[PDB]
Amino acid sequence: SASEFNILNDGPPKETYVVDDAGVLSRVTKSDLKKLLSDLEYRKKLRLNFITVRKLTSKADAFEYADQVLEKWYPSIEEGNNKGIVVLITSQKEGAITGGPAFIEAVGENILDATVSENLPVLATDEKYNEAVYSSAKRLVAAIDGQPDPGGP
Ligand SMILES: [Ca+2]
């Protein structure tokens, strides 16, 4: 699909932290994401990007595609070490999260697995894409900052 290709092709958003290809997020929430994530990057030197896509032309799943984006956008560990990539496939109500070792290590498997099995699928099923993405961003940030886990929906 032009979507699957564009997302890969266009590379990472170095000004915004979001590629809303499915167009399911409001400009206000995208502004709030940029603020939250630009602050995370300033403080912890971790660059977390969110990607929304309606459907994947290929048969690959969310995690497979997330990994494909990580490797294409950041083709070396020097570039990808502190990078995190969250994918949300809106039609499937499925999410995935991948990243470099430093990013993965900072979040922890507990929160990584919880965000993808709770916040993302649950909120998107209820058509709350803005909350799905922003609550996930908040939950991952809390894990990174060693703060109390806000929990899922
Ligand atoms: Ca799309």
UniProtKB/Swiss-Prot annotation:
<dbReference type="GO" id="GO:0031977">
    <property type="term" value="C:thylakoid lumen"/>
</dbReference>
<dbReference type="GO" id="GO:0009534">
    <property type="term" value="C:chloroplast thylakoid"/>
</dbReference>
<keyword id="KW-0472">Membrane</keyword>
<dbReference type="GO" id="GO:0009507">
    <property type="term" value="C:chloroplast"/>
</dbReference>
<dbReference type="GO" id="GO:0009579">
    <property type="term" value="C:thylakoid"/>
</dbReference>
<keyword id="KW-0150">Chloroplast</keyword>
<dbReference type="GO" id="GO:0005634">
    <property type="term" value="C:nucleus"/>
</dbReference>
<keyword id="KW-0934">Plastid</keyword>
<keyword id="KW-0793">Thylakoid</keyword>
<protein>
    <recommendedName>
        <fullName>UPF0603 protein At1g54780, chloroplastic</fullName>
    </recommendedName>
</protein>
<keyword id="KW-1133">Transmembrane helix</keyword>
<keyword id="KW-0812">Transmembrane</keyword>
<comment type="similarity">
    <text>Belongs to the UPF0603 family.</text>
</comment>
<dbReference type="GO" id="GO:0009535">
    <property type="term" value="C:chloroplast thylakoid membrane"/>
</dbReference>
<dbReference type="GO" id="GO:0003993">
    <property type="term" value="F:acid phosphatase activity"/>
</dbReference>
<dbReference type="GO" id="GO:0010206">
    <property type="term" value="P:photosystem II repair"/>
</dbReference>
<dbReference type="GO" id="GO:0003729">
    <property type="term" value="F:mRNA binding"/>
</dbReference>
<keyword id="KW-0809">Transit peptide</keyword>
